[PDB]
Amino acid sequence: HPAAHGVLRLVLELDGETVMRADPHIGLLHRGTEKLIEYKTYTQALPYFDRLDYVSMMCNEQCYSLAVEKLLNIDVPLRAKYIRTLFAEITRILNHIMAVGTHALDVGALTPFFWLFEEREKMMEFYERVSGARMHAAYIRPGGVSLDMPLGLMDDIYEFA
Amino acid sequence: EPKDIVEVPKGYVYVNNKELSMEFADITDRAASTMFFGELLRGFAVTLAHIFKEPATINYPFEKGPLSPRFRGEHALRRYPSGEERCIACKLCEAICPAQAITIEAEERADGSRRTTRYDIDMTKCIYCGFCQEACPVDAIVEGPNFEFSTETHEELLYNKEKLLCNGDKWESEIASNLQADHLYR
Amino acid sequence: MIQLMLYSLIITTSIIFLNMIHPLALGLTLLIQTIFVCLLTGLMTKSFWYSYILFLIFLGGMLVLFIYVTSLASNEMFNLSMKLTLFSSLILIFMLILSFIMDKTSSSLFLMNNDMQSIINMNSYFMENSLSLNKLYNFPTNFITILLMNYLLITLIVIVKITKLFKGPIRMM
Amino acid sequence: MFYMEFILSLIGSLLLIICVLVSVAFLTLLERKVLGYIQIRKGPNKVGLMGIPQPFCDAIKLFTKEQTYPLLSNYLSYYISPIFSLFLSLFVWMCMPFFVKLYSFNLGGLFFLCCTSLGVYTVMVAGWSSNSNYALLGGLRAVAQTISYEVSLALILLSFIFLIGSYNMIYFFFYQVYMWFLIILFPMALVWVSISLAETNRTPFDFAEGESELVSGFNVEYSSGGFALIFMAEYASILFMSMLFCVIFLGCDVFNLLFYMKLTFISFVFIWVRGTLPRFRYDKLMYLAWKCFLSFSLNYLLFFIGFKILLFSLL
Amino acid sequence: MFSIIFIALLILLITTIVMFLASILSKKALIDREKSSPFECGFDPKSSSRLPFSLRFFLITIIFLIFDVEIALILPMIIIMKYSNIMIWTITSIIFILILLIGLYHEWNQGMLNWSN
Amino acid sequence: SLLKRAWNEIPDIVGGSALALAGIVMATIGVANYYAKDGDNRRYKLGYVVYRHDDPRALKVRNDED
Amino acid sequence: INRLTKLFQMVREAGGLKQAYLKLYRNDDLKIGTLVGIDKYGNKYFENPYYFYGRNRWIEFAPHVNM
Amino acid sequence: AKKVKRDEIEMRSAQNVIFPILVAERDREFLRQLRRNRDEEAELMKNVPGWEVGTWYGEPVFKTLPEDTLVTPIFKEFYAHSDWKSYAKRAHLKLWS
Amino acid sequence: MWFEILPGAVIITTLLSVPIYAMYGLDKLMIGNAFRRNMDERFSRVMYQRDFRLTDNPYKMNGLDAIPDEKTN
Ligand SMILES: COC1=C(OC)C(=O)C(C/C=C(\C)CC/C=C(\C)CC/C=C(\C)CC/C=C(\C)CC/C=C(\C)CC/C=C(/C)CC/C=C(\C)CC/C=C(\C)CCC=C(C)C)=C(C)C1=O
Ligand code: SF4
Ligand code: SF4
């Protein structure tokens, strides 16, 4: 069903159109992620978190990166913090567009999906321009981000904003 | 303006806090829109306005991109300007590959140089993470610019060394240009 | 001429209608016949105004009973009756044969169509339905219409009281 | 002479039939281009030359694709419902006014009311015949639509009828010679479009299809042949109902060229709205028809009963 | 009429030919036990569609039958306005529409127009 | 008050009833005006109406200009 | 209001309506640009900053390919 | 509304100048037909036991009417001696076949 | 770039206008008269019978030339 996002299986108990009981059968996308991680080095496990919450890409890395840092008991440089925080917000702006964009389609409105996914396309150029991938950047890492921003990116980040 | 039902502290913004006025000046204003489709009117002006904009579509394949030099795509084994393959079968790429998509078997070459007799990438298992090109100490393996290599058979997506080497020659000019413009960051 | 063929079809559809069991089979039979009767009535009248009204009225009743059929008699069965198909098809062609070899000046109904009226009839040159529907809204017969109004409104009070909406939906428990 | 007359009537219907059937093909393209431009997209542009032959390029596919024989469906009903859906869509065009006579149709306004109501059974039977949960919900979602718009539709037609004096559509031309009834009937024009959407089951009243609530509504179990006719029958309804708006509120100069410039524009409006509004909630429509529209429409019968009475005294 | 019936049949024949072309022009492949299974989002169905489907607008459903039969009595109005007595026509018509409104507002206020809850 | 509540809750029934009330008013003007002109006797008659000069109706022929 | 003057120009470099139509039929668009260069295989590369960023640089495939 | 009424009255006034003309024509042909039917009835039923022209076996179909009181017969009876084609040519002009 | 819509609207506008502009053409070519008689009112139908009887073609007009010019008196 299109609104189910291809994963959910609501076994509804319909008394006409009104729902009396809803059973969200989950697990159609269980890929034993947490068991594979037990077999992979910490660095090899970083990409797994891009996949979890796949619309908030760089936000999941940050959670993983912060966790490892607390155990490693290290601190990140001042510049890397701002790059992280900047890209946490860009990810947040991306994600809410998907939520607003997707939610509108479920209701039925179409144009907000396209008017916003045009901006979403511009935003994922910044992911592509720093990490090399439009999605699943694998950019945030426990020691801080993996590369400096390209020269002249920040001008284009301003231009979008 | 109407008042707020709940007083707001500092550093917080409310979305539905303002109450509804009950003055005839305002009720009629709400009534007029509710009665002549006033709210929907401006909604129709906006959508019509978008008719008069250049659409943002790109005429692919004649026009395409844009990308950046850091783009991760199809793989390729480079070689030195002499022609000798760069890869020395160090196997760092195999050990770091999150997907275990790389298989390497190495043997003492006839001339006695450490080299691979086997180098296979299972493109249906790779995730294009790019850890292989970061770990290679001699830049032997790179993710080339190509992203247009869809096939019609599963078997054709399993690259062996000869296929990888061919890409490293077809794409040599562009890879050498990306590395030069990007190595300092890396 | 088609009047006789309309006679045959209305007869044919009525024979099968006696033999329907499935409620929707009844409904389809009834819907088809409501078309013919509506068509036939306008042949013997100065206008088809009433066929339009009758057709519109019954279609309202057609939908509603499907809604209840689909809630009460949803799970039922059809059975093609080779006896029925042959019998109707047998008589149908038989009846159609007669209508070709019938003295169909004799079979035509004596009721005066609009054209059947004389040329001198001055009252036949007005709007198609002016006079006929006229005294529905003139003294004294207008009060009958008024009487319906209460009757219809009073009916509208009867259904809600019989129905007792608040005590739940309807299911075929 | 008379023998010849009815020959011409056949030609007109066939000519009107093929022309309407062709237009609904090109309307579907227009829907995709316009809806592709309200959205900042480009729309179909590659196939053939500049996308114009796109709808024909789709009519090939929907007919070279196999019929579906559902396991649990009453096949004969499932197989016939597309026919009557398309037939009723084309048949209602014979009442469209022509000054070059096609059909007299005194009481033409009623003939509209009868035909449009019939369009619900085809959806209704198709959904129930398919014998799928979604299809049945689509069918019963369509029937509930009729319970809402049907009554208010007649009353609003009656208001327009009071202005002209008869149910013959031709008289709309004479009374709209100096001006357009849009001015006198602005809220009804706005209301009438709203009900017109329900007739054709379009966003914001798209419940029979019910896309993204039901997977595809009552069409969920149709395929190559049946689904195509269901589709064409859908867009024939839009085209006619758009025309019926042009004869009522926009002059009704059927022999003038501009009337057809107007006709396409109202067709654009129907696409325009689909790209603006979200779908209503299944109950909010039925409440809307009975709580607001029905009360609204009755209020102006008094306004037009008084106005006609007042005008009758002067004239 | 008789003209319309003929074209009504002629159209029905034409539309009928369309699928009769589609049924032959359609690609033909062996039907599978799963190809003809119903569509219910890819998981087998628990419940036949022919179970009793509960109803909540039943009350409105009945009121719909009524309100139409008063549409049979308003429609003739126009046709007989030039020909009728104006007092009788005026009075009766008004007390026709007031009766309808009063009936509607009465039920609306009683909450019958709301669905079963 | 009452006026405010409805005007805030169901403004259409107020505006609609406002024009409905207009109908009754200007229906009461037109109907009274109709018998203020003796409009039962209409100068143009449907059909071919011919009276004898001595018939009572022949006196009541409405005499107009055009 | 004055795009026709551009439109006529596109025809002239195209080589008349006959070659203009084949261009439209092939590339699905008519655009003005300066020939940046020609590759070994005949593809001609154009550029015009007038258009927006994505459509700024485009390529004409070799004639012999044709679809 | 004035202009529509203006035009309508003009159309109706044209009828009242043509309507008397047709009535004159119809009467002079309606009567002529009646003689033929009264003559066709005589020839058709020479040998019937007790048939009298214009009555059901001698029973007048109107007892109260004054003498020589002409009564327009039924449409069907007017066409009692005619093919179906002529009948349908007038009764179905509205429907057009 | 809003031009690309117009090719869609031109076709629909033309196709829908073919019928009325075709019958106006066919009737002239095949009746001799642009419009066909309107059987909307009894009087129209009545006279239509009259024309169909006299000329044996309702759309062929009988001008004054049908009148017997002279009477010998
Ligand atoms: C990703 O997010 C999104 C979604 O979420 C899933 C959406 O749902 C959506 C949903 C989008 C929509 C609902 C758009 C509206 C589209 C649809 C509902 C259906 C898609 C189909 C179309 C648009 C095509 C329109 C046309 C049809 C379906 C077929 C209609 C029938 C047609 C055209 C035939 C007309 C008949 C004719 C006689 C015309 C003239 C002649 C022909 C066709 C004959 C053809 C050829 C021959 C006879 C061969 C002869 C050969 C020889 C003699 C040699 C969007 C946009 C989205 O972005
Ligand atoms: S890109 Fe990542 S997953 Fe793919 S081969 Fe290289 S290291 Fe392995
Ligand atoms: S890391 Fe580089 S040198 Fe080492 S085995 Fe891999 S490709 Fe060869």
From TrEMBL, chain A:
<comment type="similarity">
    <text>Belongs to the complex I 49 kDa subunit family.</text>
</comment>
<feature type="modified residue" description="Symmetric dimethylarginine">
    <location>
        <position position="31"/>
    </location>
</feature>
<protein>
    <recommendedName>
        <fullName>Complex I-49kD</fullName>
    </recommendedName>
</protein>
TrEMBL record, chain D:
<keyword id="KW-0520">NAD</keyword>
<dbReference type="GO" id="GO:0008137">
    <property type="term" value="F:NADH dehydrogenase (ubiquinone) activity"/>
</dbReference>
<feature type="transmembrane region" description="Helical">
    <location>
        <begin position="107"/>
        <end position="127"/>
    </location>
</feature>
<keyword id="KW-0813">Transport</keyword>
<keyword id="KW-0999">Mitochondrion inner membrane</keyword>
<feature type="transmembrane region" description="Helical">
    <location>
        <begin position="177"/>
        <end position="195"/>
    </location>
</feature>
<feature type="transmembrane region" description="Helical">
    <location>
        <begin position="147"/>
        <end position="165"/>
    </location>
</feature>
<comment type="function">
    <text>Core subunit of the mitochondrial membrane respiratory chain NADH dehydrogenase (Complex I) that is believed to belong to the minimal assembly required for catalysis. Complex I functions in the transfer of electrons from NADH to the respiratory chain. The immediate electron acceptor for the enzyme is believed to be ubiquinone.</text>
</comment>
<keyword id="KW-0830">Ubiquinone</keyword>
<feature type="transmembrane region" description="Helical">
    <location>
        <begin position="227"/>
        <end position="250"/>
    </location>
</feature>
<feature type="transmembrane region" description="Helical">
    <location>
        <begin position="257"/>
        <end position="275"/>
    </location>
</feature>
<dbReference type="InterPro" id="IPR018086">
    <property type="entry name" value="NADH_UbQ_OxRdtase_su1_CS"/>
</dbReference>
TrEMBL record, chain G:
<comment type="subunit">
    <text>Complex I is composed of 45 different subunits.</text>
</comment>
<comment type="similarity">
    <text>Belongs to the complex I NDUFA12 subunit family.</text>
</comment>
<comment type="function">
    <text>Accessory subunit of the mitochondrial membrane respiratory chain NADH dehydrogenase (Complex I), that is believed not to be involved in catalysis. Complex I functions in the transfer of electrons from NADH to the respiratory chain. The immediate electron acceptor for the enzyme is believed to be ubiquinone.</text>
</comment>
<protein>
    <recommendedName>
        <fullName>NADH dehydrogenase [ubiquinone] 1 alpha subcomplex subunit 12</fullName>
    </recommendedName>
</protein>
From TrEMBL, chain H:
<dbReference type="GO" id="GO:0045271">
    <property type="term" value="C:respiratory chain complex I"/>
</dbReference>
<comment type="similarity">
    <text>Belongs to the complex I NDUFA13 subunit family.</text>
</comment>
<keyword id="KW-0679">Respiratory chain</keyword>
<comment type="function">
    <text>Complex I functions in the transfer of electrons from NADH to the respiratory chain. Accessory subunit of the mitochondrial membrane respiratory chain NADH dehydrogenase (Complex I), that is believed not to be involved in catalysis.</text>
</comment>
<keyword id="KW-0999">Mitochondrion inner membrane</keyword>
<dbReference type="GO" id="GO:0005743">
    <property type="term" value="C:mitochondrial inner membrane"/>
</dbReference>
<comment type="function">
    <text>Accessory subunit of the mitochondrial membrane respiratory chain NADH dehydrogenase (Complex I), that is believed not to be involved in catalysis. Complex I functions in the transfer of electrons from NADH to the respiratory chain. The immediate electron acceptor for the enzyme is believed to be ubiquinone. Involved in the interferon/all-trans-retinoic acid (IFN/RA) induced cell death. This apoptotic activity is inhibited by interaction with viral IRF1. Prevents the transactivation of STAT3 target genes.</text>
</comment>
<dbReference type="GO" id="GO:0006120">
    <property type="term" value="P:mitochondrial electron transport, NADH to ubiquinone"/>
</dbReference>
<keyword id="KW-1133">Transmembrane helix</keyword>
<keyword id="KW-0813">Transport</keyword>
<keyword id="KW-0249">Electron transport</keyword>
<keyword id="KW-0496">Mitochondrion</keyword>
